[PDB]
Amino acid sequence: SVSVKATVTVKLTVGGFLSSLIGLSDVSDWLGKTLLLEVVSSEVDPKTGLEKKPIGAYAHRAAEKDGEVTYESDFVIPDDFGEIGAVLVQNEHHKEMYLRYIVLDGFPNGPIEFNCSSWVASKFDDPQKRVFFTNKSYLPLETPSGLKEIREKELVTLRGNGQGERKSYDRIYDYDVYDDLGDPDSSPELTRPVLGGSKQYPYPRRCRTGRPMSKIDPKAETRSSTVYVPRDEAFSDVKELTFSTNTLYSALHAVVPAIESVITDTSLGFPLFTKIDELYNEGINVPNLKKHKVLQDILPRLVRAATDSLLQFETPQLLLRDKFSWFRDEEFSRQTLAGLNPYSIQLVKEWPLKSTLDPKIYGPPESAITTEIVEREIKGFMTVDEALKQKKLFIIDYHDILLPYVSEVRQIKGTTLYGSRALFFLGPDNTLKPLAIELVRPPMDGKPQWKQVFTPSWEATGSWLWKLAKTHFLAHDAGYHQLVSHWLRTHCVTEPYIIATNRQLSAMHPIYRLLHPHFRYTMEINALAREALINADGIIESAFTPGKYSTEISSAAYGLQWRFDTQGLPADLISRGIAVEDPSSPHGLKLAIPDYPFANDGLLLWDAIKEWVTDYVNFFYKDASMVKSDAELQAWWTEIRTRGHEDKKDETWWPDLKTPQDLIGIVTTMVWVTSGHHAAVNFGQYAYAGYFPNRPTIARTNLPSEDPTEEGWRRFLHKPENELLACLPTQLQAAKVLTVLDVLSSHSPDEEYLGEHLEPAWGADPLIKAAFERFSGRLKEIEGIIDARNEDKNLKNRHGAGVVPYELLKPFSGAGVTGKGVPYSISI
């Protein structure tokens, strides 16, 4: 018999810490007397073939260091037991405890580490014993015989039965539709359509919460301020208060209601551009502030010291470099390639431009952007048909997706809408020139279709109409960026992958341990987004052009455009006509826009990631038969298509999962989206939209040339800047958006950067640890490649007088709003 010492390290903390500290509803009641431990053998009883009996041991307290308590248990294990493959834990305390890790000592051949990083419920809440595996990873068919049944049982435990209201201690991962965003029990004006489950509103599923349905609106799930996620996905409880989720929680439920308390007039615009400059210079006095000093610690870039507090915004990086760049047309076009939404521009392949909408409903489909209008601005270089053949015309085209909403959005007080197109021309020095913006209003109110084209002009009136048309198009791009490029294609579509990973891949599965850092933090951020960002009267509705139709439009974009096989960066660039496969070219891709900072730097990250994923997959899957025979892997991919993205389960574009290369393609796509895609659309938000006239979230008024009256037109001619002010966000909308965007762009102190620190199971296997080291080195090299590109005067889309260097895909960064740094996961 061998003597064994079990050391259990527990973190000192409590759930729901921040809510109290900032005032929205003892230390001795926290920790328990003892913990029951059971060591589990990796091998079944030889000869009998049944599972050996776990050997128990109760564990008691010992020391307290660095905010972490140790629990100790000295026991003895028979020698015919074999290696230990897992440990079972039961909490006898009446409250949950957070277990950091477990070390088994006294073994000759070495210490045995278990990575817990989990809350262990009070047995009185859930009597089921928790199992923790060693850092050794196994395909299902390689599971040690003594662990095969416990592996399957734990998966059964996390799947649950698809019923019941989820309790805070549950660990059950399952799907449901977005039926929780409206508030019909509060007003029928807060009623919202269910997103997911129909041909008309397709949508990714989210984590099932199972709260009771409303009696007023039986399709709506009742609202709660405590939105369930499985217990360990609520990372905010064991992170510092500067953690992303904690800072965003504080902004949405403390700072924003405080803003709404001092800026009560919801229709008060800025009367002067100087008043906009005050947001950054003098700020806003907010006398209302519960626990004001705590917020000064949590949000130092926002809440400043003094019984009352000052809300004051930092200068956005765009303005620190060039106070005037926001109205230069070349910076407008530069930002389609290097700004916060690099995902919309595509190649023009058909000419003239023509809508696909039913002309019997939406009016004449021919674009008002004419060949002669184009040649007026490019002919000193080339003709239109020349430009088409040489891939020099590019477009951002929101016409067909936005026009079906115009009539309805225009019924909302304080906003309007157009179908819009922005046309660009790639010059000889590889910089974009904006050629035209077209704005359409469909036939409605008995009037016919309204349609105009605006261009940079030689005279003041057309020049001002151009500026107002940019404001409208920019507001459409803000909505598309926030709802589609950002919310839909990262946050929203990823949550079903997370759910399926926990439902179908065992915690000891290698692909689970590969995906895990890329999936942390996201489910909890998304739950807060459903509670306060994309809900009825939430942040986006209150400040973006489409109002209450904002989230529906992301459903339409999902149904119309989203497919898994174009989410990887090469396939996205190819799909938009920006690249063609070319063995001669860097990365195998010939770019029709050669200086495209987002895409140039993204392909460096894509290759580095792919090579890491290749090394990892090849370590565990030596051939196609090992892929096809992995029942967990196959069940995982199947559930992603059939439940997570159920509304697209029948589409033909889903990749096969039959070879190791198939798996590499699938994983690289997922983890590129959660790291670099999200980073590129997320951490530049304050830099470019913090000074909101550069990127307004809403254009509140129609163009003066839309059915003008003599008196309105004369107002426009007299004081055109006042038309822009009346069109730009209100003071309340500006403060709310700036507050949220500053938080979203901020790297928390404990941000986990792509390829900086390895996972426990990765560092436990020498060949994986080595591959991670090569990955980390590749990323550090990429840092140096990007830094040189930002000093290259030939790359005018990232280097120039007053130009912001493109750093959003530099992997590593310090804390704060730095404009660089790529986390593993969607963390904010």
Q: Which parts are annotated binding residues for Fe(3+)?
A: 486, 491, 678, 828
**Is residue 509 annotated as a catalytic residue, yes or no?**
no
C-alpha to C-alpha distance for 153 and 130, rounded to whole angstroms: 11
In the set 486, 587, 677, 747, the catalytic residue is 486
Q: By CB under 8 A, tell whether 452 contacts a second copy.
A: no
Listed ranges 439-447, 460-468, 745-753, 808-816: which one lies at the site for a second copy (CB under 8 A): 460-468
Q: 68 near 7, Cβ under 8 Å?
A: no
**Is residue 682 annotated as a catalytic residue, yes or no?**
yes
**210 vs 479 by CB, closer to Fe ion:** 479
Read off the DSSP letter of residue 549. G
Q: By CB under 5 A, tell whether 674 contacts Fe ion.
A: no
For residue 668, the partner it binds in a second copy, Fe ion, none, with Cβ less than 5 to 8 A by kind, is: none
For residue 682, the partner it binds in Fe ion, a second copy, none, with Cβ less than 5 to 8 A by kind, is: Fe ion
Residues in the interface with a second copy (CB under 8 A) total 46
**475 vs 528 by CB, closer to Fe ion:** 528
Find all residues with CB under 8 Å of 239, minimum gap 6, and list them: 245, 246, 748, 750
C-alpha to C-alpha distance for 366 and 25, rounded to whole angstroms: 58
Query: Structure tokens of 386?
Result: 């020349």
Helix (H, G, I), strand (E, B) or coil at 802: coil
Cis-peptide, bond into residue 805, ω within 30° of zero: no
Q: By CB under 8 A, tell whether 800 contacts a second copy.
A: yes
Query: Structure tokens of 552?
Result: 């529906």
Site string for a second copy, 713-752 (x = CB under 8 A): ---xxxxxx-------------------------------
Helices marked H in 415-492 — which ranges? 460-480
**458 vs 653 by CB, closer to a second copy:** 458
Q: By CB under 8 A, tell whether 277 contacts a second copy.
A: yes
**Sites for a second copy among residues 228-247 (CB under 8 A):** none
**432 vs 754 by CB, closer to Fe ion:** 754
Listed ranges 21-29, 31-39, 452-460, 562-570: which one lies at the site for a second copy (CB under 8 A): 452-460
**404 vs 427 by CB, closer to a second copy:** 427
Q: By CB under 5 A, tell whether 682 contacts Fe ion.
A: yes
CA nearest to 406, candidates 476, 454, 489: 476
**316 vs 800 by CB, closer to a second copy:** 800
C-alpha to C-alpha distance for 630 and 636, rounded to whole angstroms: 10
Q: By CB under 8 A, tell whether 653 contacts a second copy.
A: no
**CB 386 to a second copy: min, Å:** 13
Site string for a second copy, 679-698 (x = CB under 8 A): --------------------
Q: E-assigned strands of 442-587?
A: 450-454, 579-581
**Is residue 718 annotated as a catalytic residue, yes or no?**
no
CA distances from 441 to 70, 351, 689 (A): 67, 21, 26
Q: By CB under 8 A, tell whether 662 contacts a second copy.
A: no
In the set 509, 678, 747, 826, the catalytic residue is 678
Listed ranges 118-126, 281-289, 663-671, 674-682: which one lies at the site for Fe ion (CB under 5 A): 674-682
Widest Cα–Cα separation across the chain:
99
In DSSP notation, 255-318 reads IHHHHHHH---TT---SSHHHHHHHHHT-EEE---TTHHHHHHH-TTTEE---SEEE-PPPPHH
C-alpha to C-alpha distance for 526 and 239, rounded to whole angstroms: 17
Q: By CB under 8 A, tell whether 787 contacts a second copy.
A: no
Q: By CB under 8 A, tell whether 631 contacts a second copy.
A: no
**36 vs 373 by CB, closer to a second copy:** 373
C-alpha to C-alpha distance for 129 and 119, rounded to whole angstroms: 12
**Is residue 150 annotated as a catalytic residue, yes or no?**
no
**Sites for a second copy among residues 333-392 (CB under 8 A):** 334, 375-381
**CB 272 to a second copy: min, Å:** 9
In DSSP notation, 41-106 reads ESS--TTT-SPPPPEEEEEEEEEEETTEEEEEEEEEE-GGG--EEEEEEEE-SSS-EEEEEEEEE-
C-alpha to C-alpha distance for 90 and 128, rounded to whole angstroms: 8
**387 vs 744 by CB, closer to Fe ion:** 744
CA nearest to 455, candidates 475, 441, 473, 476: 473
**Is residue 678 annotated as a catalytic residue, yes or no?**
yes
- At position 567, the amino acid (one-letter code) is Q
In the set 491, 518, 645, 747, the catalytic residue is 491
Nearest 5°: the CA angle 75, 81, 84 is 75
CA 484 to chain centre: 10
Q: E-assigned strands of 121-190?
A: 130-133, 175-176
For residue 29, the partner it binds in Fe ion, a second copy, none, with Cβ less than 5 to 8 A by kind, is: none
Q: 826 near 494, Cβ under 8 Å?
A: yes
**CB 775 to Fe ion: min, Å:** 23
Q: By CB under 8 A, tell whether 710 contacts a second copy.
A: no
Q: Residues 511-544, buried b or exposed e (16+ Cβ, 10 A)?
A: bbbbbbbbbbbbbbbbbbbbbbbbbbebbbbbbb
Single out the residue of 588, 796, 812, 816 in contact with a second copy (rule: CB under 8 A). 796
Single out the residue of 53, 293, 323, 649 in contact with a second copy (rule: CB under 8 A). 323
In the set 341, 682, 702, 797, the catalytic residue is 682
Q: By CB under 8 A, tell whether 463 contacts a second copy.
A: yes
**CB 342 to Fe ion: min, Å:** 15
**CB 379 to a second copy: min, Å:** 4
Query: Structure tokens of 424?
Result: 């660009």
Helix (H, G, I), strand (E, B) or coil at 136: coil
Phi (first) and psi of residue 106, to 5 degrees: 90, -5
Binding site for Fe ion (CB under 5 A): 682
Binding site for a second copy (CB under 8 A): 273-274, 277, 281, 321-325, 327-328, 330-331, 334, 375-381, 427, 429, 431, 433, 457-461, 463-465, 716-721, 793, 796, 799-803
Active-site residue list = 486, 491, 678, 682, 828
